[PDB]
């Protein structure tokens, strides 16, 4: 029914601008305006303002009057947050939210911004296959290591997303100035290596797409 799906997470060096979209589904856009909330890493939840999706007038919280600008692609049921002249302390997650029932009833997924200086490094995608010997159980765990990229984000799927059950994707972590991510997938021992299992990785900032099929070590 109601889905507010947000853009993916960006990386931006200080000074830049970002436009975060919120695409609304399930309601009539026009009778319910949008709340923009900032949940800062430590600090907790904060109201950034509200936009009248009918007239188009924004209210900003005083903390947010200035670099922040709400707007909407009415026509497509999108509300957008734009933060100009990005300050380093704006790294946090921003949620769109529907104001209804004397409060807020639905929240989006969040779009996380990491304001941070750094060039652009494409990831190296490495297959993780089991040890050279044996590996005999009722199931089997394969993996995919996405190493040394910048900035965030990368997306990772298994078999173009048709294999989602039994998957653990591990949050990217910064190490020596670069991000590293990994994912595991577990399937029955009959599936692999009988049927092909492929790691799909995209790094938008570098226009890098890598498809890596997990092959047996021998």
């Amino acid at each position: 029914q109601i889905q507010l799906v947000q853009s993916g997470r960006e990386v931006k060096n200080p000074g830049e601008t970002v436009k975060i979209s919120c695409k609304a589904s399930g309601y009539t856009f026009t009778e319910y305006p949008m709340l923009w909330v900032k949940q800062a890493p430590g600090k907790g939840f904060r109201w950034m303002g509200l936009i009248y999706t009918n007239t188009g007038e924004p209210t900003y919280a005083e903390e947010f009057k200035g670099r922040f600008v709400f707007s909407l692609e009415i026509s497509a049921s999108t509300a957008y947050l734009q933060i100009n002249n990005l300050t380093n302390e704006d790294t946090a997650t921003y949620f769109c939210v529907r104001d209804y029932f004397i409060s807020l009833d639905y929240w989006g997924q969040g779009t996380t911004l990491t304001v941070s200086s750094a060039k652009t490094t494409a990831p190296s995608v490495y297959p993780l296959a089991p040890v050279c010997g044996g590996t005999t159980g009722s199931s089997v765990t394969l993996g995919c290591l996405v190493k040394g990229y910048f900035p965030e984000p990368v997306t990772l799927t298994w078999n173009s997303g048709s294999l989602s059950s039994g998957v653990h994707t591990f949050p990217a972590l910064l190490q020596s100035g670069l991000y590293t991510l990994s994912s595991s997938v577990t399937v029955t021992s009959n599936t692999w290596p009988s049927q092909t299992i492929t790691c799909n990785v995209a790094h938008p900032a570098s226009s890098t797409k890598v498809d890596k099929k997990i092959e047996s070590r021998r």
Partner: protein, 325 residues
């Protein structure tokens, strides 16, 4: 949903959101159009006429209509609500007595108003029947798609809310609803206007000597006599009335037929009505010689009919005519 001072609010004069003004027992069809100060109808936002928004606190409460009760001498029948305004089929009553049930409390409102329901016709019933002739009564509509009149509805004035004036551990502490405009000072000398967020009070201490006000004119009101003026201006907000009085033909009265009896140039009429019936005639000579009498008690009457003719009006039953040569 405006809130005003109900006059005999169960106990005595409360401030009910359903404070009754402008009772109109002026139609014929058993109906009264009423204005609550409460604006039931859609919710705060957009849906379902059959929900229920009154004021609780400074705040609305846009919820279900579950257990409305208009009543008078007897319990009335709702007809329809729109806006501040309800139409309800009532019997006669010295008063008018309104009330819903929020669920935790009865929370009613009551008022004086002389009510009657004459149906249109020479029959003085107390109530509309199932049958009889139709004829042009005055009556209010069921509907809302209505513009035939509009009443001024500009802003509210301020309102009191001493829930605001808390204490800052030694000083009296005002707050704000949502950033609304709170108009503030105390008998002592401190902040003199008040257009603020949550202020404190340097000078005075007692809650009972300060200006707990709410200039909250984001939504206009009905211009009740039980409203304090918004002193600034005649803001806009011309707003219609739903329940226009219309020329409905009420299902209406009819009195039982007469017993015509002949005599020499004379109508004996043994007569026997249901209710008080205004009978009247017109001796069609240039000498009119008419007669009028409400008849509720069965009565054998007489009429010296002339040569040229007489006519005879048994209530709103059609007029008869008679050759008495």
């Amino acid at each position: 949903p405006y809130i005003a001072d109900c006059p005999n609010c169960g106990h005595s004069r409360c401030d009910s959101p359903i404070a009754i003004e402008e009772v109109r027992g002026d139609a014929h069809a058993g109906v009264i159009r009423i204005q609550t100060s409460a604006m039931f109808g859609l919710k705060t936002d957009g849906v379902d006429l059959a929900y229920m928004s009154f004021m609780n606190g400074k705040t609305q409460k846009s919820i279900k209509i579950d257990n409305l009760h208009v009543r008078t001498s007897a319990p009335c029948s709702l007809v329809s609500h729109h806006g501040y305004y309800i139409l309800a089929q009532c019997p006669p009553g010295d008063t008018v007595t309104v009330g819903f049930h929020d669920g935790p409390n009865r929370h009613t409102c009551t008022v004086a108003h002389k009510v009657e329901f004459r149906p249109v016709g020479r029959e003085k019933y107390r109530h509309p029947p199932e049958h009889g002739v139709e004829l042009p009564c005055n009556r209010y509509t069921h509907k809302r798609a209505d513009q035939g009149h509009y009443v001024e509805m500009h802003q509210p004035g301020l309102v009191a809310d001493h829930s605001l004036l808390s204490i800052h551990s030694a000083k009296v502490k005002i707050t704000v609803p949502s950033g609304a405009q709170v108009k503030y000072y105390c008998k002592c000398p401190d902040v003199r206007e008040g257009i603020t967020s949550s202020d404190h009070t340097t000078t005075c201490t007692d809650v009972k000597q300060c200006r707990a006000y709410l200039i909250d004119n984001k939504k206009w009101v009905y211009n009740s006599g039980r409203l304090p003026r918004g002193e600034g201006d005649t803001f806009k907000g011309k707003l219609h009335v739903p329940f226009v009085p219309v020329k409905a033909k009420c299902i209406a009265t009819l009195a039982p037929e007469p017993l015509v009896e002949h005599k020499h140039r004379t109508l004996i009429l043994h007569l026997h009505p249901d209710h008080p019936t205004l009978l009247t005639t017109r001796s069609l000579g240039s000498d009119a010689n008419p007669t009028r009498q409400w008849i509720e008690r069965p009565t054998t009457v007489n009429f010296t009919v002339t040569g040229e003719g007489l006519e005879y009006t048994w209530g709103n039953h059609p007029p008869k005519r008679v050759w008495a040569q």
